[PDB]
Amino acid sequence: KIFQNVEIKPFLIDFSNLFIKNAAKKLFQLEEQLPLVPVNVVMDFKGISRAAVHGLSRVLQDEIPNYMLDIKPGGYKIEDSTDLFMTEQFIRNRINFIPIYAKNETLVFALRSLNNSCEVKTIYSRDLIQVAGPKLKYPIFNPTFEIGFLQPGKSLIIEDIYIKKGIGRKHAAFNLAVKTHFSHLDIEQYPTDKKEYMALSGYKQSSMTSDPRHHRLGLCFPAVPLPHINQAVRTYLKNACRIIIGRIQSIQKIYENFEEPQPELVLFSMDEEKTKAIITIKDETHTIGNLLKTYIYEMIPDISFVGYQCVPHKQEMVLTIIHKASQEDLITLLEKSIQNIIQTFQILEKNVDELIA
Amino acid sequence: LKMIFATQQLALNYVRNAGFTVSTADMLLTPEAHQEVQEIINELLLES
Amino acid sequence: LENPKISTFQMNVSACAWYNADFDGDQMNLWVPWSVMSRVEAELLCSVRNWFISTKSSGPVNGQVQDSTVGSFLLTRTNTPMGKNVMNKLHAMGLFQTTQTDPPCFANYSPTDLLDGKSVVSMLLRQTPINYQRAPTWYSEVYAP
Amino acid sequence: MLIPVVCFTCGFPIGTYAAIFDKARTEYIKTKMGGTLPQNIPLDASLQIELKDLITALGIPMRVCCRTHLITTLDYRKYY
Amino acid sequence: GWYCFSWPYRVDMNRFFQFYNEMPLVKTIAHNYVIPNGLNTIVAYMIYGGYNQEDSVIVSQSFIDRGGFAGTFYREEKVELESDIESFGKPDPLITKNLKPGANYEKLVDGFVPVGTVVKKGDI
Amino acid sequence: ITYGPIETVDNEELTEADMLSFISAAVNSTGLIGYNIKSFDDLMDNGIPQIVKQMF
Amino acid sequence: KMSSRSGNKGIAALALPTSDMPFTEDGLQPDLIVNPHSHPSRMTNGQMIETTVGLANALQGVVTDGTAFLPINVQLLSERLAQEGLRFNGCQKMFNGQTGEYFDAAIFIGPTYHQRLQKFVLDD
Ligand SMILES: [Mg+2]
Ligand SMILES: [Zn+2]
């Protein structure tokens, strides 16, 4: 059981506060909770490296496929968008960042707003109407967002609001989880309130010598349906594990073809006894590089050199291995390490199934 | 020039594990050490 | 730079001493020789390794500034607030995974072996061995009492 | 021109509570002053009222960034 | 910042309108009389890989994507006519001399490009 | 005018934040741009007619 | 080009993804990372006091006044931080976003008001 003891806690509105209650009631006729809530998830992992836990956290932050609302070109109707302050750039940036929980990309929405009054009118997300796809049984976003405001006599019409897919590493509107906690449970700590220790981190070991294997990770997910918190959280965790397995398998499929010449793998024989391998993967990140280095180092404690590089201006990951074996034996060890990674994350997903009810 | 680059990467990769910051509390005298500065200053204004 | 969102001329911070430049909004010119004759003499005559020693003063121009000055001190410092200034084999190997040189050999080292910062620096200065003996800027008669 | 949809720094959706927060803050500050002319209320005096527990009641966490951006963002509807 | 509150009614040259502005957490008396233009950024004072050396900063890409310090920039034009000599209209290459080489005349309708179309380098 | 004796004024609870109200009063009376419009009003009220009639 | 209100201006040199930025034990991460070597010679000490004061302002929920020549006490302002649950120096435990490893030193991180200067790289 690699990870145990999950704790799930939705962020809820306190209607016992009178001012919040009155504002909610008179603005949205809201007396209950919202359809979608943020959920805080705190997980404890044991017997695992921080390469794996931190790679999981990084993937859940901004390397997992996610969905957002976008506007198709020509959907912003310039003809009947009489309002001059609500420009397309502003409204599009507002709409891209509404958190949604959507289960198909066939849905399409529209915004058709008129200000037939003498005051400034505020547009809310409840004013988006679904114009395509199957009818929603449950909402996919909250109705309380402010999208814009119209001067008297003005209008805003936007058609063709669809659901787009991506990862938060490319555009941050596809980010998923926000960090709320991270710590190691097998390193002791100082009391850092004392002015003797307040310049130090607090841990009693240096990070240049410590090797923790017991962690606590906390992440918050921004918009989850109220009656399906456990299901949504479970699905997110499983997808993170699967993403990591897929990328590791992409590297595995390169390793096995070390006989055929490949632009992604280079093998040298530096001496009569030492072999050097260089793996260059385009558009890979610190997640896979760190995982590969850690597991190669665990498999070969007596290696000459292992290291990786992700230079920001190169958009690639380069892994270098130098070992005192022949090419075939080195490839055997590398495949063993990659299998260890895959096995660890499969165990993680099975544990997710067992823990979250 | 190749050595300046190499020793610069060693130094930078060390600090990405060690940290280096500066705070407002780094420039703050202790309450008793503040009174010692005032005594030194009064001696100057006494000799002046 | 193949990222299409970048419009700047980028350089190493230790090259700014040649041009007396910094990064608060300075602009520099750049032209690429296209002729064979102008390309030969750019590489053999006008490379920046020819201006490492000053013509004006006859001393060196380049070196560390600001992060490698204080990061070289922290690396070769004997004691840290945590005890001795040591790292394990994984972190000693990690200091070299960016230097763009040939990596050293750590095969006579176990995962729990500890390496001092002066040990790691020597793995780099062995390629170009020199002799040096002075006192650092750190030791000052002003601070000694 | 409005309170952002998400926190600029972390991405927490502070904008789902922005309207409630703005109205509730108006009511709370009026309660703390006790019925005074909007111009006779100094700008400085109303900004010294603590909104810690109001934001806590909205369900927004104790993050520095989220409360900063929820509290300090200027509203274009109040300047034009 | 909000350089003027009547920007959509103006045709200015090299003016920038920034969408989001904040009151400083530590304000001064000058903010009783002018509109603040800026943001309350979270700043870490540290060394991170050597990319902020000598008056440089490292920015969060997410902060940029979310509209931190984002806005719209404007450029104007003013082309005049001569009495009965010149006129506005889509040129005809056969009866007009000295058409600018490589210039895209297909964007023009009724002499001007319509509102809402992206113009490129080389377009008329 | 006779002013009351200076030995009976209560200012011991005047703080340096109380003194910023004097600056507030000064700016409110003056306006940030005060002279530029007063000068033009005088030019349109007393300067142009006198300079046209009694100078040429 | 950005700048703070103490005249400390700099160029954006690198932009990092969310998973690549440093974060504290509670998940706070910066928008900007400025070099500490920009401080000691310029002596822009009011920018560091603003980070100290505004850090407690954000948790309190208030906006305060920091006008020049008002009485200040950096000792008493640093004790306000401790009363709010923070450290005396306003420094926290931080982790490297790329490796997940913690620094052996608390990092000074907090809110500082910044401005975008109208000097655009696309124009020059
Ligand atoms: Mg300069
Ligand atoms: Zn936030």
Side-chain angles (χ1 to χ4, degrees), chain A residues 104-117:
Chain A
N104 43 353
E105 275 136 301
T106 307
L107 312 169
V108 172
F109 298 87
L111 175 64
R112 312 189 181 113
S113 266
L114 254 298
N115 190 3
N116 267 273
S117 170

PDB file of all heavy atoms in Angstrom, chain A residues 104-117:
ATOM      1  N   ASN A 104     -18.334  16.090 -22.435  1.00  0.00           N
ATOM      2  CA  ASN A 104     -18.165  15.905 -23.870  1.00  0.00           C
ATOM      3  C   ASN A 104     -17.936  17.252 -24.529  1.00  0.00           C
ATOM      4  O   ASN A 104     -18.342  18.292 -24.011  1.00  0.00           O
ATOM      5  CB  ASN A 104     -19.362  15.202 -24.516  1.00  0.00           C
ATOM      6  CG  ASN A 104     -20.676  15.712 -24.009  1.00  0.00           C
ATOM      7  OD1 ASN A 104     -20.728  16.504 -23.077  1.00  0.00           O
ATOM      8  ND2 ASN A 104     -21.755  15.265 -24.629  1.00  0.00           N
ATOM      9  N   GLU A 105     -17.298  17.209 -25.690  1.00  0.00           N
ATOM     10  CA  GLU A 105     -16.932  18.401 -26.436  1.00  0.00           C
ATOM     11  C   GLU A 105     -17.996  18.829 -27.430  1.00  0.00           C
ATOM     12  O   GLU A 105     -17.766  19.775 -28.191  1.00  0.00           O
ATOM     13  CB  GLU A 105     -15.615  18.163 -27.178  1.00  0.00           C
ATOM     14  CG  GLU A 105     -14.373  18.415 -26.338  1.00  0.00           C
ATOM     15  CD  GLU A 105     -13.327  17.337 -26.503  1.00  0.00           C
ATOM     16  OE1 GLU A 105     -13.636  16.161 -26.216  1.00  0.00           O
ATOM     17  OE2 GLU A 105     -12.196  17.663 -26.911  1.00  0.00           O
ATOM     18  N   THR A 106     -19.144  18.155 -27.448  1.00  0.00           N
ATOM     19  CA  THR A 106     -20.180  18.458 -28.424  1.00  0.00           C
ATOM     20  C   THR A 106     -21.027  19.654 -27.999  1.00  0.00           C
ATOM     21  O   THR A 106     -21.738  20.231 -28.826  1.00  0.00           O
ATOM     22  CB  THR A 106     -21.039  17.212 -28.629  1.00  0.00           C
ATOM     23  OG1 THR A 106     -20.186  16.112 -28.956  1.00  0.00           O
ATOM     24  CG2 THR A 106     -22.028  17.397 -29.761  1.00  0.00           C
ATOM     25  N   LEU A 107     -20.953  20.050 -26.730  1.00  0.00           N
ATOM     26  CA  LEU A 107     -21.743  21.175 -26.243  1.00  0.00           C
ATOM     27  C   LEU A 107     -21.262  22.489 -26.847  1.00  0.00           C
ATOM     28  O   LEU A 107     -20.061  22.708 -27.017  1.00  0.00           O
ATOM     29  CB  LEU A 107     -21.670  21.249 -24.721  1.00  0.00           C
ATOM     30  CG  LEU A 107     -21.889  19.980 -23.909  1.00  0.00           C
ATOM     31  CD1 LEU A 107     -21.509  20.220 -22.472  1.00  0.00           C
ATOM     32  CD2 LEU A 107     -23.325  19.545 -23.990  1.00  0.00           C
ATOM     33  N   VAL A 108     -22.206  23.368 -27.164  1.00  0.00           N
ATOM     34  CA  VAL A 108     -21.919  24.706 -27.664  1.00  0.00           C
ATOM     35  C   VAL A 108     -22.839  25.677 -26.938  1.00  0.00           C
ATOM     36  O   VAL A 108     -23.989  25.340 -26.646  1.00  0.00           O
ATOM     37  CB  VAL A 108     -22.103  24.801 -29.192  1.00  0.00           C
ATOM     38  CG1 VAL A 108     -21.984  26.225 -29.660  1.00  0.00           C
ATOM     39  CG2 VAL A 108     -21.080  23.939 -29.903  1.00  0.00           C
ATOM     40  N   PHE A 109     -22.324  26.856 -26.608  1.00  0.00           N
ATOM     41  CA  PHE A 109     -23.067  27.858 -25.864  1.00  0.00           C
ATOM     42  C   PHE A 109     -23.145  29.153 -26.659  1.00  0.00           C
ATOM     43  O   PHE A 109     -22.538  29.295 -27.720  1.00  0.00           O
ATOM     44  CB  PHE A 109     -22.423  28.121 -24.497  1.00  0.00           C
ATOM     45  CG  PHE A 109     -22.398  26.923 -23.608  1.00  0.00           C
ATOM     46  CD1 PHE A 109     -21.356  26.026 -23.669  1.00  0.00           C
ATOM     47  CD2 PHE A 109     -23.427  26.682 -22.726  1.00  0.00           C
ATOM     48  CE1 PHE A 109     -21.341  24.925 -22.869  1.00  0.00           C
ATOM     49  CE2 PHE A 109     -23.412  25.581 -21.923  1.00  0.00           C
ATOM     50  CZ  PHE A 109     -22.371  24.701 -21.992  1.00  0.00           C
ATOM     51  N   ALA A 110     -23.907  30.102 -26.126  1.00  0.00           N
ATOM     52  CA  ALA A 110     -24.079  31.399 -26.756  1.00  0.00           C
ATOM     53  C   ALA A 110     -24.384  32.443 -25.695  1.00  0.00           C
ATOM     54  O   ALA A 110     -24.927  32.133 -24.635  1.00  0.00           O
ATOM     55  CB  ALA A 110     -25.198  31.369 -27.798  1.00  0.00           C
ATOM     56  N   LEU A 111     -24.044  33.688 -25.998  1.00  0.00           N
ATOM     57  CA  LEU A 111     -24.310  34.818 -25.116  1.00  0.00           C
ATOM     58  C   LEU A 111     -25.019  35.883 -25.937  1.00  0.00           C
ATOM     59  O   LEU A 111     -24.454  36.387 -26.909  1.00  0.00           O
ATOM     60  CB  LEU A 111     -23.013  35.351 -24.508  1.00  0.00           C
ATOM     61  CG  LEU A 111     -23.047  36.609 -23.642  1.00  0.00           C
ATOM     62  CD1 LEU A 111     -23.856  36.369 -22.394  1.00  0.00           C
ATOM     63  CD2 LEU A 111     -21.643  37.023 -23.281  1.00  0.00           C
ATOM     64  N   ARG A 112     -26.258  36.208 -25.573  1.00  0.00           N
ATOM     65  CA  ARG A 112     -27.073  37.184 -26.299  1.00  0.00           C
ATOM     66  C   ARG A 112     -27.664  38.155 -25.284  1.00  0.00           C
ATOM     67  O   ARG A 112     -28.701  37.872 -24.681  1.00  0.00           O
ATOM     68  CB  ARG A 112     -28.169  36.494 -27.110  1.00  0.00           C
ATOM     69  CG  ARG A 112     -27.684  35.330 -27.951  1.00  0.00           C
ATOM     70  CD  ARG A 112     -28.760  34.834 -28.889  1.00  0.00           C
ATOM     71  NE  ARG A 112     -28.318  33.704 -29.698  1.00  0.00           N
ATOM     72  CZ  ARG A 112     -28.795  32.473 -29.593  1.00  0.00           C
ATOM     73  NH1 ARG A 112     -29.736  32.170 -28.720  1.00  0.00           N
ATOM     74  NH2 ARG A 112     -28.326  31.524 -30.396  1.00  0.00           N
ATOM     75  N   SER A 113     -27.018  39.302 -25.102  1.00  0.00           N
ATOM     76  CA  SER A 113     -27.343  40.224 -24.023  1.00  0.00           C
ATOM     77  C   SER A 113     -27.690  41.596 -24.576  1.00  0.00           C
ATOM     78  O   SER A 113     -27.016  42.096 -25.477  1.00  0.00           O
ATOM     79  CB  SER A 113     -26.182  40.340 -23.040  1.00  0.00           C
ATOM     80  OG  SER A 113     -26.352  39.444 -21.964  1.00  0.00           O
ATOM     81  N   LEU A 114     -28.742  42.199 -24.029  1.00  0.00           N
ATOM     82  CA  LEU A 114     -29.165  43.549 -24.371  1.00  0.00           C
ATOM     83  C   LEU A 114     -29.335  44.353 -23.095  1.00  0.00           C
ATOM     84  O   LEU A 114     -29.816  43.825 -22.090  1.00  0.00           O
ATOM     85  CB  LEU A 114     -30.482  43.544 -25.148  1.00  0.00           C
ATOM     86  CG  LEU A 114     -30.438  43.829 -26.646  1.00  0.00           C
ATOM     87  CD1 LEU A 114     -29.893  45.229 -26.913  1.00  0.00           C
ATOM     88  CD2 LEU A 114     -29.648  42.770 -27.383  1.00  0.00           C
ATOM     89  N   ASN A 115     -28.954  45.622 -23.134  1.00  0.00           N
ATOM     90  CA  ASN A 115     -29.176  46.554 -22.032  1.00  0.00           C
ATOM     91  C   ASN A 115     -30.255  47.535 -22.474  1.00  0.00           C
ATOM     92  O   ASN A 115     -29.965  48.587 -23.043  1.00  0.00           O
ATOM     93  CB  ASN A 115     -27.893  47.269 -21.647  1.00  0.00           C
ATOM     94  CG  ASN A 115     -28.022  48.051 -20.364  1.00  0.00           C
ATOM     95  OD1 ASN A 115     -29.055  48.027 -19.712  1.00  0.00           O
ATOM     96  ND2 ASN A 115     -26.970  48.753 -19.999  1.00  0.00           N
ATOM     97  N   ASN A 116     -31.509  47.184 -22.209  1.00  0.00           N
ATOM     98  CA  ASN A 116     -32.642  48.045 -22.509  1.00  0.00           C
ATOM     99  C   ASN A 116     -33.075  48.859 -21.300  1.00  0.00           C
ATOM    100  O   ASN A 116     -34.276  49.040 -21.078  1.00  0.00           O
ATOM    101  CB  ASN A 116     -33.811  47.220 -23.040  1.00  0.00           C
ATOM    102  CG  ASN A 116     -33.824  47.141 -24.549  1.00  0.00           C
ATOM    103  OD1 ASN A 116     -34.384  48.005 -25.215  1.00  0.00           O
ATOM    104  ND2 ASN A 116     -33.208  46.102 -25.097  1.00  0.00           N
ATOM    105  N   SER A 117     -32.125  49.333 -20.508  1.00  0.00           N
ATOM    106  CA  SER A 117     -32.391  50.109 -19.313  1.00  0.00           C
ATOM    107  C   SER A 117     -31.561  51.382 -19.342  1.00  0.00           C
ATOM    108  O   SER A 117     -30.877  51.684 -20.321  1.00  0.00           O
ATOM    109  CB  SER A 117     -32.094  49.289 -18.058  1.00  0.00           C
ATOM    110  OG  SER A 117     -32.128  50.104 -16.905  1.00  0.00           O
TER     111      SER A 117
END
